[PDB]
Symmetry: D2
Subunit: 141 residues, 4 copies
């Protein structure tokens, strides 16, 4: 149940993620996704997916949330991320594009909580687990 995070904080994060879905702009898939991030200063940021007529332009909820955090000055030290989506049964897991984005700013043990639309199903995995052998700045020279 996510180490390094108070029960109240985790409860708050999950509430923030479900509510973030309301900010979704998805007139093409109609599939809404919400995401919340807890900073090292215990501040909560939220994001939602934003689609576009040109499908390549879609921005996921996770990336929206991270953009918000980064623009607010929080370069690192994030404590947790919660992702919630309009999936009735299965939990919403971040897509590869988002995993690559998250990997750029968090430590290997960074916790990512994935929920289904109501939170009746949940899973917790670390950044390291979701993106093994991550491609990073080390591959450049």
């Amino acid at each position: 149940k996510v180490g390094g995070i108070e029960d109240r904080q985790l409860e708050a994060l999950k509430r923030a993620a479900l509510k973030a879905c309301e900010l979704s702009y998805s007139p093409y898939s109609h599939f809404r996704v919400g995401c919340s991030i807890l900073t090292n200063n215990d501040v909560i940021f939220t994001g939602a997916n934003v689609e576009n007529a040109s499908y390549s332009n879609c921005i996921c909820a996770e990336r929206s949330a991270m953009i918000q955090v980064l623009m607010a000055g929080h370069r690192s030290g994030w404590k947790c991320m919660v992702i919630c989506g309009d999936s009735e049964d299965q939990c919403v897991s971040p897509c590869g594009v988002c995993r690559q984005f998250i990997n750029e700013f968090v430590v290997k043990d960074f916790p990512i909580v994935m929920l289904n639309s109501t939170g009746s199903r949940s899973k917790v995995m670390t950044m390291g687990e979701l993106l093994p052998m991550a491609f990073g700045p080390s591959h450049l020279n």
Copy 2:
């Protein structure tokens, strides 16, 4: 230039875009770009480019700025956008990816102001001029 927008607001937009470059995360290209957007109720949002080891994952300043706007619940009626980048002489222009993103939320007369790195010069173009015969929902 830039009708329907007071000069006071345009000026404030220009400085915000200039200063937005400081929020950039570009440890790879080292090229910084700042963007500011004025909403219909005259609130200013700013954004900067965010790079990634994987070039595919980079987010331009214009898109980071629009994300800020959208996540604040302003899904329509933006009044103007100013882009400023680390370009000595020439005015930084929005790439095609960002033009397509912007086109999704603004009218054709939407003004896009492009500044040089110092903000001593500018060039104004409308969304319609920057992305003619744009791919839109009507097509879908």
Copy 3:
């Protein structure tokens, strides 16, 4: 089309129309086809490829360009035709594709856009479609 022999343009339009059969689009069901004429007067074709993650979708224009580039033609393309799944409206390239094309062609590069059947056509240069390119 300036500088394009009519037999090349006709062949291009035909290649674009049939290219949409290579499309993988189970999400939008919107099939798009694209063909490119090399300076070599060789025709290459592409179709859109979608993905569960919309961000990963590759348009037909880009699939066609990948094909041309992987064949070793990094310059001198003569024309491009795009055939969209829009019945009564010519399909125009999205901003992402315009930026991609701009990387390899001259400002006068012609881009022909057709509706789903090819009964309607519209031509525009690269420079007209992406003014003041980045």
Copy 4:
């Protein structure tokens, strides 16, 4: 033996094709070249290289270039193996999250992905399932 289900000759041929595919790379911004090779069910080999753009967001990795080739050739599934090799000598080139999500759309969980360094010195074999767990895929 190195990779299950793949003959030693085939693989050898794949590694050579991937290394050679690097010369087709268009990378004037990062200068980092990447080559990729794919073995179809039909035993045919396709190759691809990375293609960059002034707008970094528009870059297409070698893995995606090779898959576009395969798909446009009519091979919608049943791929046997994928080989990836980059300019990085001191370590193998692993696919970025973008490519993993793309590959995941067309292959089975046990699909083998071979990663090599610039020369071929180092190598590592991992399956699609290991590279992208809890994948947000078609299934």
